[PDB]
Amino acid sequence: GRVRTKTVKRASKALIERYYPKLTLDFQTNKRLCDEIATIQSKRLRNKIAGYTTHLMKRIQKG
Amino acid sequence: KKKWSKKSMKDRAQHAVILDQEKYDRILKEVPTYRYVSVSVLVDRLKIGGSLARIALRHLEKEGIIKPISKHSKQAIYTRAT
Amino acid sequence: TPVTLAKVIKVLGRTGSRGGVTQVRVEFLEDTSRTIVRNVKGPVRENDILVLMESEREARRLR
Amino acid sequence: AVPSVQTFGKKKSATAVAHVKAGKGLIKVNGSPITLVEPEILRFKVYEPLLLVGLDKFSNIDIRVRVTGGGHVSQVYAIRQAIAKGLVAYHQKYVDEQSKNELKKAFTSYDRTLLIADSRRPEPKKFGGKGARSRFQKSYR
Amino acid sequence: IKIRITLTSTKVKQLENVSSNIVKNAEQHNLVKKGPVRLPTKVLKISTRKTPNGEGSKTWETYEMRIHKRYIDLEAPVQIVKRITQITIEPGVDVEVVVA
Amino acid sequence: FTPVVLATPIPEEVQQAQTEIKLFNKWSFEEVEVKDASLVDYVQVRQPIFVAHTAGRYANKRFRKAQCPIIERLTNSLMMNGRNNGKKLKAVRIIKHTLDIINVLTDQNPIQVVVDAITNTGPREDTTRVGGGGAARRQAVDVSPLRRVNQAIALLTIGAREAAFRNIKTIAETLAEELINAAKGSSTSYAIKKKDELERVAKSNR
Amino acid sequence: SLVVQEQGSFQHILRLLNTNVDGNIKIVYALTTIKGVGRRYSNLVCKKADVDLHKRAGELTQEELERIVQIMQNPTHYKIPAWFLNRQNDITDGKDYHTLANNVESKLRDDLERLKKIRAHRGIRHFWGLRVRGQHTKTTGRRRA
Amino acid sequence: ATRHVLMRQGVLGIKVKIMRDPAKSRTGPKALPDAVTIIEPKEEEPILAPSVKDY
Amino acid sequence: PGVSVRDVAAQDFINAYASFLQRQGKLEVPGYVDIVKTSSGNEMPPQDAEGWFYKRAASVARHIYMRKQVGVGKLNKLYGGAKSRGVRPYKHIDASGSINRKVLQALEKIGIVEISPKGGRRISENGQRDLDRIAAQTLEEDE
RNA sequence: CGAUAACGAACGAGACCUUAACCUACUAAAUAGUGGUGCUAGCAUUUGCUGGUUAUCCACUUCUUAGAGGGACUAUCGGUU
RNA sequence: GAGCCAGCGAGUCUAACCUUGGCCGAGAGGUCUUGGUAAUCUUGUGAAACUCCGUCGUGCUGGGGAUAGAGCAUUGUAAUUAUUGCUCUUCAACGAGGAAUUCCUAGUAAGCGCAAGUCAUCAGCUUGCGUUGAUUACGUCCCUGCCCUUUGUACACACCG
């Protein structure tokens, strides 16, 4: 299935904790700021983290 | 050993492999009113070997009664002329 | 061969002891909105027409 | 100079590269014209795009194709993908986007394979069997 | 003079920094060249059983040795040639030059 | 219509196939409206093709085999029994000859005769197992339209195959006569006999 | 395309060298029906006999058939390459012979009993009815005994 | 590492496995895939007004 | 328009060429024709027994012309094929090098082919002109 | 996901690596190809088509390889929770 | 008879490997040469199945090729209980397989051949490669077994208790 592990979810959680203004709802810019703002040893992992952060930013923007 | 088959005899068909004047004018007058014609049609409906069937197909498409629509090998397809 | 043409509007679920059959809700086309619930062999989903060799039976379940 | 492009069509192992330019309306494949592809039914299969759009779009353009790799039928699919991509490339490069897009719309609405390629790349074989999934046989007694 | 340098190793990044300092040395000295012609990689496969004895499942392992080969063509007079050969000896990579 | 020429000459009949409507070499995929409103949407017309061979990704999803062209499904069913695995070229060859045989006889559209035949030989009610414990029993149920299509094509192909086995009547013509028999409804065709056998056993175990 | 009507010249069966031969079939495979001759030698000797292969067996002439058998019992005279023969460099003469319809089983028994009388391995295997060519005999072939 | 050792009663196998720290690698991956770093953004005192500093 | 073997079809052209050569005088024949199986794998000899040398000749002239340089080895791997090794599974096997050498030497005699350096044979200009010119004659033959 | 006498953790899974696919975007190359020039063969010659040619050179990297890289994260939309 | 298209991969230095070409031989094979330490030459591995034409004819028959007989070559110090190959001849079971049972959900099954491992010679074996390419599901626990929980137990070499 498309479910994701705790490294993804906790990383996404922490980035939205202390970087909510600097990022946004756009998958592309979230990836292109993720690459530098958090050192990640896997490109596929970076993409997964970016996707979940955008999921949570859509949730935050309505409610 | 055991077989699980029966293997009885049959006619051991005597399809012609050469012909005579009776078979010749027979096939000349009887092969029309056969909207579909092929090697197998002549064999099963006229009780002739498949070589005669093929050679007669060449003969009949040369004079012109049977109109081919496909002259592909292993399957020959003819109508009749009208 | 008097048959009945009826259309599945809902699929209830797989039945048979081996998941080999299904339960469906089927609406008669002649005299519409008179429903019935019946069985199917092959793959099927909603809105799907099906011939019935009789109309007046409803097998509930099976093992 | 010349108005010309060079595209391709891939397959299982077959790559068919096609050069297109302004000519006199000729089509060739391995130096042999389009009517000599010779699976003799797949011939119509490779005629299909130009029949869909009509030979009007081939009036003063010459296409020459060269093919390698795999079976006869794989070569055929590679050829038709190559000429479809090359015609759409020619109308991307010099002719207007309207003609290109309606052309490509017809090609895709007929079949996705003429432009996009079959990505079913073959699975390897593993041990334990003759193939990728089929194991040999179990015996107990 | 018409030399050809070639490298025949397996440790990729070693070979690649070798080719890189070679070509930047060559281009800083402003010498003709081709690029690093990267040949097809050759994978040596040895496929055998895991089991020393005969029993267990028939489980096969396939070990591989990946070999990478590169080469460049150069022109330079003999003194700079021999200095270029005696420099850029990085371990793991095997090197050889030929002429004509 | 105008016959347009180019530097490489093309045959004029295929130019005709180009200008009006795509077809076979001869036959017209239109006016093949089927009689069974159940089996429509699980047959495939009004998207014509020249060849009965294409690398359609049909077995990835569930009902993508319904969107496959029906005559392609017939070809795909013909190549089996081991020795004829693969060999789609001989499959489409046998289809070409079979359709020509059907159309020299019964002079309407042989595509029409294959769709009327498959909806004729559709099995409509089947039977299924109930377990029991110690002993198994049956119970008769209804059938999906897609399964009618699949069963009809399987029945027709296998009947023509075993009819063609060990006799002079070639597979093309034996398929054609099986098709026209199933088309009219013959009670002499393998397909119809297996069909009403199954419907009878269903009726019993109703 | 050639069609011609066969009259009483045809015969359903015929005779060649102490062996019945079937008409109503192709001559080359009719010849193969005779023992001591297979498809190769039959086709070869029909070409050397200079006669139609397309024609069947029963509808042939006695001059054709005697010409054929004349070739068959002295082939090397009729310029056959001398490696077609089924007994080349015979043990008793060193000549290249062709054994035929009746002589085949005879000469078979002849060289077999030669091995049997010189007490050779192959001879004793032929005697007991075992396998002679070094086969495995443990597993395969129980349904001959 | 794997080793054999011979006592009078027979052989004893020893094996040793040592996982070093990734961060001290000095060549290769300096980390682990399921380990990531979340660097701190320096918080900023706000504008409090619009204003400009010229060069 | 201009014509070449690649412009004309394959089997009919070889048929027309081999027929032209069988009518065209004295080519060359080995002498062991109507004897041999043309391979090690072919379980029988050919059917057009008086023919089939000319078919082989026409095909090799076409084949060499399409290509640049070939050898009797390449020709054997080309013209042979599957063998039924009885019970044992099929296998590729090479055809009769004597047949291919002899048809090539016949072609060198008539001059269609020409021995070529860097190994092999090659189409001559005489071979080039008469092969292409027979191709021109053949695609107008049907009318 | 959360529920909660449990809190916080570790191994396994996932992550990771290889291989297969995509890149007409970078580095490029007679030990891979492409086009063009000359030399040259054939057919039609009317404009052309099909070829051969490493010392004939000129250019390009789409196909071919490899290096660094990019790309998919279920993106977007609609239901369901 | 013609057409006739792959991919993975292996190769000689103080040795005798892959071997192209041309010449002889029906063929196996021999011969004199060549190229290659390899994207370079073997090799575009011109593979097979396939297609196009004909011959065949429903005939244990041109299906099928065990079984045997004679001869010609190669490998090897040595081939005898035939290494292998080539040629001719002999042409037996086998007419789709009984209770049963195996593998399989996509370029997968299945058909097809190819290289490598073994190797002086010997593939019906294996490991990989590509060529042609389906039908049938998107489910269930009914069979065979697995995982978690609840429950029962006179079980603990643990239900073969």
UniProtKB/Swiss-Prot annotation, chain B:
BP-aspect Gene Ontology terms: cytoplasmic translation
Domain of life: Eukaryota
Keywords linked to the UniProt accession: Cytoplasm, Methylation, Ribonucleoprotein, Ribosomal protein
Compartments where located: Cytoplasm
Regions of compositional bias (Basic residues) in chain numbering: 1-7
Keyword hit for ATP-binding: no
GO CC term (a single one): cytosol
Organism: Saccharomyces cerevisiae (strain ATCC 204508 / S288c) (Baker's yeast)
Family of this protein: Belongs to the eukaryotic ribosomal protein eS25 family.
Entire protein: shown range: 24 to 105 of 108
Name listed for the protein in its UniProt record: Small ribosomal subunit protein eS25A
Disulphide connectivity of cysteines: none
GO-annotated molecular function: structural constituent of ribosome
Further facts: It is presumed that the precursor part of S25 is engaged in assembling of the small subunit, thus being essential in ribosome maturation.
Protein task: Component of the ribosome, a large ribonucleoprotein complex responsible for the synthesis of proteins in the cell. The small ribosomal subunit (SSU) binds messenger RNAs (mRNAs) and translates the encoded message by selecting cognate aminoacyl-transfer RNA (tRNA) molecules. The large subunit (LSU) contains the ribosomal catalytic site termed the peptidyl transferase center (PTC), which catalyzes the formation of peptide bonds, thereby polymerizing the amino acids delivered by tRNAs into a polypeptide chain.
Higher taxonomy: Eukaryota, Fungi, Dikarya, Ascomycota, Saccharomycotina
Keyword Ribosomal protein: yes
Curated annotation (Swiss-Prot), chain C:
One GO MF term attached to the UniProt entry: structural constituent of ribosome
Lineage: superkingdom: Eukaryota
InterPro entries: NA-bd_OB-fold, Ribosomal_eS28, Ribosomal_eS28_CS
Keyword list, A-Z: Acetylation, Cytoplasm, Ribonucleoprotein, Ribosomal protein
Subcellular location: Cytoplasm
Entry PTM: N-terminally acetylated by acetyltransferase NatB.
Keyword GTP-binding: no
A GO CC annotation given for this chain: cytosol
One GO BP annotation of this record: maturation of SSU-rRNA
Record's miscellaneous remark: Present with 94500 molecules/cell in log phase SD medium.
HAMAP family linked to this entry: Ribosomal_eS28
Biological function: Component of the ribosome, a large ribonucleoprotein complex responsible for the synthesis of proteins in the cell. The small ribosomal subunit (SSU) binds messenger RNAs (mRNAs) and translates the encoded message by selecting cognate aminoacyl-transfer RNA (tRNA) molecules. The large subunit (LSU) contains the ribosomal catalytic site termed the peptidyl transferase center (PTC), which catalyzes the formation of peptide bonds, thereby polymerizing the amino acids delivered by tRNAs into a polypeptide chain.
Family statement drawn from the similarity comment of this UniProt entry: Belongs to the eukaryotic ribosomal protein eS28 family.
Quaternary organization: Component of the small ribosomal subunit (SSU). Mature yeast ribosomes consist of a small (40S) and a large (60S) subunit. The 40S small subunit contains 1 molecule of ribosomal RNA (18S rRNA) and 33 different proteins (encoded by 57 genes). The large 60S subunit contains 3 rRNA molecules (25S, 5.8S and 5S rRNA) and 46 different proteins (encoded by 81 genes).
Annotated gene: RPS28A
UniProtKB/Swiss-Prot annotation, chain E:
GO molecular function: mRNA binding; structural constituent of ribosome
Annotated disulfide bonds: none
Claim: Ribonucleoprotein is one of the keywords in the record: yes
Modifications the protein undergoes after translation, according to the UniProt entry: N-terminally acetylated by acetyltransferase NatA. Also partially acetylated by NatC.
Gene Ontology biological process terms in this record: cytoplasmic translation; maturation of SSU-rRNA from tricistronic rRNA transcript (SSU-rRNA, 5.8S rRNA, LSU-rRNA)
Key words of the record: Acetylation, Cytoplasm, Isopeptide bond, Ribonucleoprotein, Ribosomal protein, Ubl conjugation
GO cellular component: cytoplasm; cytosol; cytosolic small ribosomal subunit
Subcellular localization, as worded in the UniProt entry: Cytoplasm
Family the UniProt entry places it in: Belongs to the universal ribosomal protein uS10 family.
Subunit structure comment from the entry: Component of the small ribosomal subunit (SSU). Mature yeast ribosomes consist of a small (40S) and a large (60S) subunit. The 40S small subunit contains 1 molecule of ribosomal RNA (18S rRNA) and 33 different proteins (encoded by 57 genes). The large 60S subunit contains 3 rRNA molecules (25S, 5.8S and 5S rRNA) and 46 different proteins (encoded by 81 genes).
Protein name as annotated: Small ribosomal subunit protein uS10
Species this chain originates from: Saccharomyces cerevisiae (strain ATCC 204508 / S288c) (Baker's yeast)
UniProtKB/Swiss-Prot annotation, chain F:
Phosphothreonine modifications at: 8
CDD domains, per the entry: uS7_Eukaryote (cd14867)
UniProt-recorded name of the protein: Small ribosomal subunit protein uS7
Entry keyword Ribonucleoprotein: yes
Keywords: Acetylation, Cytoplasm, Isopeptide bond, Phosphoprotein, Ribonucleoprotein, Ribosomal protein, Ubl conjugation
Protein function: Component of the ribosome, a large ribonucleoprotein complex responsible for the synthesis of proteins in the cell. The small ribosomal subunit (SSU) binds messenger RNAs (mRNAs) and translates the encoded message by selecting cognate aminoacyl-transfer RNA (tRNA) molecules. The large subunit (LSU) contains the ribosomal catalytic site termed the peptidyl transferase center (PTC), which catalyzes the formation of peptide bonds, thereby polymerizing the amino acids delivered by tRNAs into a polypeptide chain.
InterPro entries: Ribosomal_uS7, Ribosomal_uS7_CS, Ribosomal_uS7_dom, Ribosomal_uS7_dom_sf, Ribosomal_uS7_euk/arc
Main location, first listed in the record: cytoplasm
Subunit structure of this chain's protein: Component of the small ribosomal subunit (SSU). Mature yeast ribosomes consist of a small (40S) and a large (60S) subunit. The 40S small subunit contains 1 molecule of ribosomal RNA (18S rRNA) and 33 different proteins (encoded by 57 genes). The large 60S subunit contains 3 rRNA molecules (25S, 5.8S and 5S rRNA) and 46 different proteins (encoded by 81 genes).
GO terms of molecular function: mRNA binding; rRNA binding; structural constituent of ribosome
Keyword Protein biosynthesis: no
Database matches in PROSITE patterns: RIBOSOMAL_S7
Organism domain of life: Eukaryota
Subcellular location(s) per record: Cytoplasm
